[PDB]
Symmetry: D2
Subunit: 320 residues, 4 copies
C-alpha cells in the first residue's frame, strides 16, 4: 500500500541500484526539503519579526547541516541576480551534490510556488568557493556523462519531491500529517504532445523572428477550433512540473536583453533535462540536446525548450 521515500530507497539499495552512501545522501536532501518547505510557508510571519532572496541563504544552511554526515558543503555566490548555489562534496569524494535552494530570487515569481533543484555527480579521478574551486567543480561536474541522479522539490499548494536515479521518474507527495514523503506515482511519463505552451509573451518584441513565428502559429485555432493554451506561473519548478504532468512545452529563449538565455546550464537546465528525458520527453537549447553541452563557465547560461517530445521538435523546426 503506502510507500515512503525511505522504504523506496532501501528497496533500491537492496536491488543494488544504489549504495547505502547514496541512500543516505538522497535521504538527507529530502530532509532539507522538509525544512525549506516550512520556511517558505511561514515566511510572512517570519518577516514580522525582498524576503525571497534572504530565504535562499537560509535554505542553503539547512541543506549544509543535513548533509554534514555525508560531506562538506561550500557555496557558489550569485554572480548576478541569481540564487546562491550550495555544492556538497562527500568526505568520500564519491558523490557531489549541486543544490539550488529555491528556484528564484523574485517575490513576484514565488507568489504561489517555488522549489529546490538538485543534481548528483560522481567524480572520475580528477565557505564561499574560490575561483580555483569554481573552475574545478565546473570541470568535475559534467551533466552529460557523470550525472547519476537528479530531482527537485516543489513547494506549492502541495509539496512534491521528484526523483530519478537513472531508471525512471518517481513522484513522492509530502503527507502533512506524518511529515513523510509518500510515493504517489511510479515511472511518470510526460505526454508525447500537449496543446499548452509556457512562455513569457511580455518579451515577444525582444525575440527573434524565428520565435515570433512559432509563437504566432500556436495561436491559430487548429483542426478543431481550439488554439493552444497559455500557462506561465513564473516559477521554473512550478511551470516545469505542470509540463511534466500534463504535457506541453516550456521555454526560456534568448532575447535582445539576454543574448544567451537566463537559466544556468549546470544548476537549473541540466537536472530538469535529465528528469524530462527519463519521463520520455526532450530538453533542448533550440538546436541541440542540453546534456551534451559541456559547461565551460561557472554561471553559464543557455536557452531552454523542454517538455513533450513532439512539442519541442516543433519549436526546433521554426528555429533551425
Amino acid at each position: 500500500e503506502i510507500i515512503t521515500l525511505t522504504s523506496w530507497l532501501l528497496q533500491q539499495e537492496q536491488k543494488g541500484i544504489i549504495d547505502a552512501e547514496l541512500t543516505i545522501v538522497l535521504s538527507s536532501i529530502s530532509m532539507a526539503c522538509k525544512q525549506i518547505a516550512s520556511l517558505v510557508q511561514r515566511a510572512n510571519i517570519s518577516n514580522l519579526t525582498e524576503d525571497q532572496k534572504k530565504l535562499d541563504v537560509i535554505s542553503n544552511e539547512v541543506f549544509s547541516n543535513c548533509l554534514r554526515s555525508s560531506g562538506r558543503t561550500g557555496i557558489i555566490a550569485s554572480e548576478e541576480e541569481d540564487v546562491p548555489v550550495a555544492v556538497e562534496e562527500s568526505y568520500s569524494g564519491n558523490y557531489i551534490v549541486v543544490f539550488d535552494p529555491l528556484d528564484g530570487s523574485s517575490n513576484l515569481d514565488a507568489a504561489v510556488s517555488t522549489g529546490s533543484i538538485f543534481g548528483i555527480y560522481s567524480p572520475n579521478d580528477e565557505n564561499t568557493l574560490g575561483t580555483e574551486e569554481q573552475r574545478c567543480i565546473v570541470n568535475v561536474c559534467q551533466p552529460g556523462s557523470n550525472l547519476l541522479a537528479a530531482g527537485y522539490c516543489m513547494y506549492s499548494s502541495s509539496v512534491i519531491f521528484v526523483l530519478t536515479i537513472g531508471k525512471g521518474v518517481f513522484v513522492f507527495t509530502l503527507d502533512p500529517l506524518y511529515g513523510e514523503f509518500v510515493l504517489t506515482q511510479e515511472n511518470l511519463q510526460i505526454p508525447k504532445s500537449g496543446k499548452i505552451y509556457s512562455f513569457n509573451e511580455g518579451n515577444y518584441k525582444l525575440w527573434d523572428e524565428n520565435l515570433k513565428k512559432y509563437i504566432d502559429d500556436l495561436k491559430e485555432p487548429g483542426p478543431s477550433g481550439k488554439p493552444y493554451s497559455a500557462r506561465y506561473i513564473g516559477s521554473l519548478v512550478g511551470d516545469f512540473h505542470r509540463t511534466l504532468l500534463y504535457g506541453g512545452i516550456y521555454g526560456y529563449p534568448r532575447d535582445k536583453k539576454s543574448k544567451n538565455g537566463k537559466l544556468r546550464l549546470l544548476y537549473e537546465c541540466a537536472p530538469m533535462s535529465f528528469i524530462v528525458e527519463q519521463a520520455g520527453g526532450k530538453g533542448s537549447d533550440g538546436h541541440q540536446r542540453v546534456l551534451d553541452i559541456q559547461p565551460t563557465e561557472i554561471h553559464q547560461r543557455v536557452p531552454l525548450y523542454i517538455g513533450s517530445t513532439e512539442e519541442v521538435e516543433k519549436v526546433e523546426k521554426y528555429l533551425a
Copy 2:
C-alpha cells in the same frame, strides 16, 4: 502577533460587526483550514481529469459542517464545467453566504494553486437531496445584489502558503496560516493595490478569438517603453492565484469575451462580484470592459461577464482601447 480570531473579536467589539457574523466568518476560516489540508494530501488520498472535481464536493461538505451552527446550506450545481456553489442561509435569515469551494474544476489549472471565494449578503426581502432547485436559484440571484447588500467578501488561497484575505467593508486584511499552531496570523493591515503595474494576466492562447480592440491593447503592452522594458506576462490559470498576485504586486488581470464565449466565462455573482468588492477596497478597479462590475444587477442564474480587474490606472487604460 495578532491572529484572525483575536482580530475578529476586536472588530465585533468596536461594533463593526455583530457576534453572529463573527461566528460566520470564524466558521468559514475553520472550513478553509480543513480544505487546505484536503488539497495538500489529495495525491495520497487518491492512493486509496476528475480529481479536482471530487475535491470540489468534499470541500463543500466541510463547509456545510462548519456552518451547521449558523444555518442550513443548499447547493447550486455545476451545469457545465463550473464549480458547484454552496449557499448558506442563516437560521436567523439576516445573512446568506455564497461559497465557491475551489476556484476551478481543472487539474491543469490547479497544478500549483487554487482557492475558495465567498461573499456575504444581507437580504432585504423574505425567506427562501441538498441541490437547490430553479425556484430557489432564482430567489438567491434576486436576493443577492452585490451593489448593495454585499457586506463582506474574501478568499483563501491554497498555494506554497495558505493566505486568507478578507474585507468587512473597511479595508483589506491578509492573514497567513501558521502551520505549527494551526492559526491564521494577521500579516497585513489595510492592503492597498498599486495604482499601476507593468504586469498583465491574460490567456494569449485565445488571442485570435478576441476583438480587434483587445488585440491592439495586448500588442501595445509588449512595446518596450522608453525604459526599454515592456510588460511582464504572468498567468497561472487559477483565478484566486492570479487575482492575489495582482492584488499584492499590481498589474491587470483579464478574462475577456471572445468568439466561443460571447459573454466571458466568469460568473457574475459567484466569482466577479466578490473579487471586485475586494479590489475596490484595496484601492483598485473591477470592470467588464465598460462598466463597474458591481453596478451590474444579476438577472440570470448562471450569468457570466468579462473581467478586467487590477490596478486603477491599468484597468482604465484597457477601458480606453475598448471605448
Copy 3:
C-alpha cells in the same frame, strides 16, 4: 450545532448576555496562550537539545501568557516562595478583570513525566489597582486582598497537556470540556455540563507519606483497602500531577487529597492559586472541595502563599473523609 469550537461557544454565551465582549476576549486569549504552552510542553526534549527542566518551562509559559493578554491588560509576576511555580497575574486595563494564572501545575520533572497543566481563575475586583515584572510585597498583598474566591471569582478553568490537550472551563453555569483538534488547531466542545459522579471507589493520595499523616487519616486510608461488597477494595491512582489527577477525578469520580503531614503542617497546595479554582470547578461539576473540615471556598486568603489541605472529588467520597477527620 455539529462542530462547536471554543470561539463559537463563547460568542453564543456573550449573545445570551452571560458574559461581555471583554471577558470573551480574555477567555479566548487564555486558550491561545494554552495552545502555545501545549506546544512547548511537547517539544521540550528537543528544545533542550539545541532537574530544573520544569522550572525554566514555568517562566517561558508565563511570558507567552503575558503576550497573549497584551491586548487586554498588563501582567506582573508573583515569584515562587519555595519550590512553587511562579504565578502570573493579569489586570485588565479597564480594571474589570484580574486573571490569576498558574502556567504549569508543578516544578518537578518526576511529576510532569506524563502530564501537567495550567490553572486559571478570573476575579471581579471591587477595590483598587496596582502599577508596573516581579510584584512587590505591597503589590502582592493587594492581589490577595482583592481576590476573594468565595465572592468575586467569576470563572475558572485549566488546560491539561497529556495524551490529549483538554481545556476545561466554567463561567458560573456548568462545566464545559473542549478538546484540542491537532489538525485544525482549534478547541472543539466535546462535553456539556460535565457532572462528577456522587461516588467512586478510587482514591488519589501519595501513600509514601503514610507515616507522616494523622491517625485520623491513617484510619481512613486503611478502611479503603478493605474488600467491601463484591470483595473489591478501592482503586489507587496517583499521577503526581495536580491537573492530571484532578481531571481523572472529575471524569470518573473518586477523591483526591493532599493532606497536611508531619513536615507540611498546613498542606502543600496554595489556597488562592491552586485550591480555589479547582474547588469552584468541582462544585460546578456537582462535587465537593474541602480542607478536611470546612468548604475551601469559605476560607479567605489572608497570607501571600497560604497553603491548605485539599480533599476534592465526589460529594459522597469527600463527606466520608470529613466524617473521619471530624
Copy 4:
C-alpha cells in the same frame, strides 16, 4: 539534529541491521505517528468502550504500514484485554508482536497510553494452532532481537533497543519526525519511588505487605519513599526508566499469576530495562528466563532499578 530515520540508516550502513529490518523499524514508527494522532483526537472522533475500538483501529493502521514488509494476523482477546497484532515478514526472517495500546480501560488511559512491540527472528483472526505455533517460535530469552514502545502522553516518545543500549526519540510536532533526544539511556541503580496499586494491599501476600510497609518508613533522612502510579504500564514503566525506582504488578488472592501478560507486555519491557542496566523479575526469577506454554500467559512483574528489584526479591525469598 539526528532524526530516527538518519539514525536508522546509519545502523544499517554499519551493518548492525539489514535493510529489511530497517524497513520494519521504520514502518513501525510510521504506524505510531498515526496512532499518536488517533489518541489525540479520540474525543472529537467520538462526537462523529472507547479505548476498546481504538484498539482495533490501531491494529489496522499497523497492518497497512507493514503491508510492505509482511502479512499480519490477530490474536483475539479472551476477556477485556487488548487484541495483539502479529506480523510475519514475507521473507519469514522476522515476526513482530505488536500491542497497539497498553490498556482497554478509559480510566487508565486518562493521561497516557502507548504501544509495545517486540521482534523475533525465527530459526483475519489467528486461531489456536497459529498461536500455539508463535509461542514455540517466539522465545524471548533466545530469539528476541529488538523491542520498544511508543508512549502517547503530554509528549510522544519512541523508545527502542536493537540489542546495544536504549535510545529515546521525541516526536517533533512541527516536522512530524522523531528526533534522537537521548543515547544509551541508563536506568539508575536505585531510586526512591515505588509504583504499585495499593488498593489491593489486602489481597497481597504477607511477604509483599511487609515490603510495602518498610517503604513507608522515613529513612535516616526522615524521608519515606515516593509513591507514583498512573495506571498505564507504558507511562509507569517510562518514568521508572528515566528517574529510577521500582514498578510492580504482583499476584493477589484472585489472580494467582498476576495480570500482565508475559509475551506481549513483560518480555519487551524486561529486555529494554536490562539494556538500560536494570532488572526485570517475577519475584523469584528473571523474566526472560521464562518461556510461555500458552501465549496469554500471565506473570507477576517487578521491574525497575537493579537494587530496588533485588530488595523486593529478598522479601519474597
